Amino acid sequence: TGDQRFGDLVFRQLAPNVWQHTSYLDMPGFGAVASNGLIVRDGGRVLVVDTAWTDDQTAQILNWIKQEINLPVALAVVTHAHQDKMGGMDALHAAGIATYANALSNQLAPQEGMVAAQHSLTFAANGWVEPATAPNFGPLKVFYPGPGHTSDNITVGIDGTDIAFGGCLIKDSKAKSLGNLGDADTEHYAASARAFGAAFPKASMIVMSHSAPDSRAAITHTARMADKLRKLX
Ligand SMILES: C[C@@H](O)[C@@H](C(=O)O)[C@@H]1NC(C(=O)O)=C(S[C@@H]2CN[C@H](C(=O)N(C)C)C2)[C@@H]1C
């Protein structure tokens, strides 16, 4: 496939300096649910997008980095306050890694059961991160598309590549549903999905939390499912 197993994780190289990490929830009651994030080598440092489901899994990602890249992890950015994205914050913090999330993700974190990130990102009215709140992010281009999967969901493009990361906002072009809608904004979801597409108009590889990377069809298929959901009444 391109995938490689390391312990209980899977890693897939997407570009010379980008890899997808995948971890699987092992809670007795759920199936082995996959969640994806990214690792980005930015020259002499590594940037992480999302934790794994648990601290231990997150620590395994750090060991894979240490072994396969062996550069310091300068920062991590997490894309919303749910377990699959922020479940491993304590592992990041035990490793002395500076962590960033949407201010709103840090405000929601105690209610959701997550450890807040150390630093809060804020956004302009057009959705682009305020650069003063995202210092030395290198190729990570952080975009808040509006409420969708959750109120706080953020997305990230990787400059120098054709990759954009949707997180749980975007589902693959064959998905049957939008997944967990318990925290979703059913009115704005579709528009937020289209905004993500518009913010990264040249990205041709769309990475998402719960499916393999897909084409831009993932974006339009998500926005459709979201508009169907809005119109059910
Ligand atoms: C527990 C959360 O991390 C949860 C969420 O993000 O809302 C997980 N993330 C999502 C999602 O929509 O991004 C879900 S549903 C996901 C999509 N495919 C699986 C599913 O549909 N299930 C029936 C669990 C897993 C997971 C339960």
Ligand SMILES: [Zn+2]
């Ligand atoms: Zn979520």
Ligand SMILES: [Zn+2]
């Ligand atoms: Zn998810």
